[PDB]
Amino acid sequence: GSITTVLNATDIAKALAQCAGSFNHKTFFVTSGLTNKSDANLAKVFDILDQDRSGFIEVDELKLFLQNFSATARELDETETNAFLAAGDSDHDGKIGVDEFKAMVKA
């Protein structure tokens, strides 16, 4: 269901507080607990993040990434969104698919 059926709330809070100034997706994946979740749980998280059901996380959905973990979190800035996309977009189509998401969280 909600994100705390996947992750611990305390871990989410720490991951959010530590990126208030500067976000790094690898740091967040570790602190939040995403890095140790099963592939199937990461496909669950992908479904949450893909707000328009397009099958891909587009850049407008990446700007809103943190708001899937707490409704009142901040938007990512452009450098942060660009770096997120560049780390995960292995097929170079400008957006993140579910296999890309599962891979980038753990490899």
CA distance 22 to 65: 14
Of 7, 32, 50, 65, the one binding Ca ion (CB under 5 A) is: 50
Contact criterion met (CB below 8 Å) for 71 and 63: no
- Binding piece for Ca ion, criterion CB under 5 A, among 22-30, 38-46, 51-59, 77-85: 51-59
Contact criterion met (CB below 8 Å) for 49 and 65: yes
CA distance to 3, 17, 41, 74, per residue, from 71 (Å) = 11, 14, 20, 9
Helix (H, G, I), strand (E, B) or coil at 55: coil
Contacts with Ca ion by CB under 5 A: the residue count is 6
Of 47, 52, 77, 78, the one binding Ca ion (CB under 5 A) is: 52
The contact mask relative to Ca ion for 58-97 (x = CB under 5 A, - = no) is -------------------------------x-x-x----
User: In angstroms, what is the minimal distance from the CB of 10 to Ca ion?
Assistant: 29
User: In angstroms, what is the minimal distance from the CB of 25 to Ca ion?
Assistant: 15
